[PDB]
Design a protein around this ligand. Structure first.
Ligand SMILES: *[C@@H]1O[C@H](CO)[C@@H](O)[C@H](O)[C@H]1NC(C)=O
Lengths: 50, 50
C-alpha cells in the first residue's frame, strides 16, 4: 500500500503483512542456540523449558 | 597276485602345504562423505540467500 496521489506533497503509507512460515532449525554442540532456515540466529537452547 | 594297496605304504616325501592367498574385494568406505561435511556447517550462505 502507498498513499493516494496529492500534488507537491509528501505522504506516508503503512503496510502490515502478517507472515507465518515453516522453517528447518539447526543447532550444534553444546546446543545452547539454534539458527533458522532464514539465517536468523536464536540465542536460546532448543530444549529450554520449565 | 595282490593289489598295490594291500601293503602298508610310508610317504618318503617331505610334504610342504602351500595355501595361495585368497582374493579380497575392497568396498568403498568414507568416514564423512562430501555431503556430510557440507551439512556440518550450521548455516549455508547459498540456501540462506536463495
Ligand atoms: C597339508 O600339509 C600337511 C603337512 O603340513 C599334510 O599333512 C596334509 O596332508 C596337506 N594337505 C592337506 C589337505 O591337509
Amino acid at each position: 500500500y502507498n498513499p493516494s496521489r496529492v500534488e507537491a506533497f509528501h505522504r506516508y503509507g503503512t503496510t502490515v503483512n502478517c507472515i507465518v512460515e515453516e522453517v528447518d532449525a539447526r543447532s550444534v554442540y553444546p546446543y545452547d542456540e539454534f539458527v533458522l532456515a532464514t539465517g536468523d540466529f536464536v540465542y536460546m537452547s532448543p530444549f529450554y523449558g520449565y | 597276485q595282490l593289489s598295490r594297496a594291500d601293503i602298508t605304504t610310508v610317504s618318503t616325501f617331505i610334504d610342504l602345504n602351500i595355501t595361495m592367498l585368497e582374493d579380497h574385494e575392497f568396498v568403498p568406505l568414507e568416514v564423512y562423505t562430501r555431503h556430510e561435511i557440507k551439512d556440518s556447517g550450521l548455516l549455508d550462505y547459498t540456501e540462506v540467500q536463495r
